[PDB]
């Protein structure tokens, strides 16, 4: 039988911790710092480049604003609707949340990647043009 002492970590899962400053045979006196300057006793902030204007100050801000009022859509593609719904049928926001192609409690829009071979009746928010094109081409319907 398998006891508590037949139990063992996976090979390479438990690596040893490097104990610094513990004699000459290992990472010895200076503990890998090697130095006499700032780095010998302190940290240099990532934002500091010795005094020239740093990279985060030489360059211009990215242009534009972010729209406070942006409407974000979860994305489903008719390809993955075909994948998840091979027999077609009624397709709803809740249905493809349940099957896992879209996050819950979000507006979802259908996009036109992939093929549609399923007679599908998809009820989503704000389809794509190619999405409606191939949804109706497969014989289905695309409804808000």
């Amino acid at each position: 039988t398998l006891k508590l002492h037949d139990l063992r970590p996976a090979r390479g899962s438990k690596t040893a911790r490097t104990r610094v400053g513990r004699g000459d045979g290992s990472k010895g006196k200076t503990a890998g710092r090697g130095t006499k300057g700032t780095r010998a006793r302190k940290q240099v902030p990532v934002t500091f480049e010795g005094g020239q204007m740093p990279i985060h100050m030489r360059l211009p801000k990215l242009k534009g604003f972010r729209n406070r009022f942006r409407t974000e859509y979860e994305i489903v593609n008719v390809g993955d609707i075909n994948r998840l719904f091979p027999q077609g049928g009624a397709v709803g926001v809740d249905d493809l949340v349940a099957k896992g192609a879209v996050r819950k409690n979000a507006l979802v829009k259908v996009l036109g990647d992939g093929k549609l071979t399923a007679k599908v009746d998809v009820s989503a928010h704000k389809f794509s043009g190619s999405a409606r094109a191939k949804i109706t081409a497969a014989g289905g319907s695309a409804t808000e």
């Binding site: 398998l2 508590l4 037949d6 139990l7 063992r8 970590p9 996976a10 899962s13």
Partner: peptide, 12 residues
Amino acid sequence: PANIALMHQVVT
């Protein structure tokens, strides 16, 4: 099946 690494993780 007994997963030794798994049960070691869980026991520790």
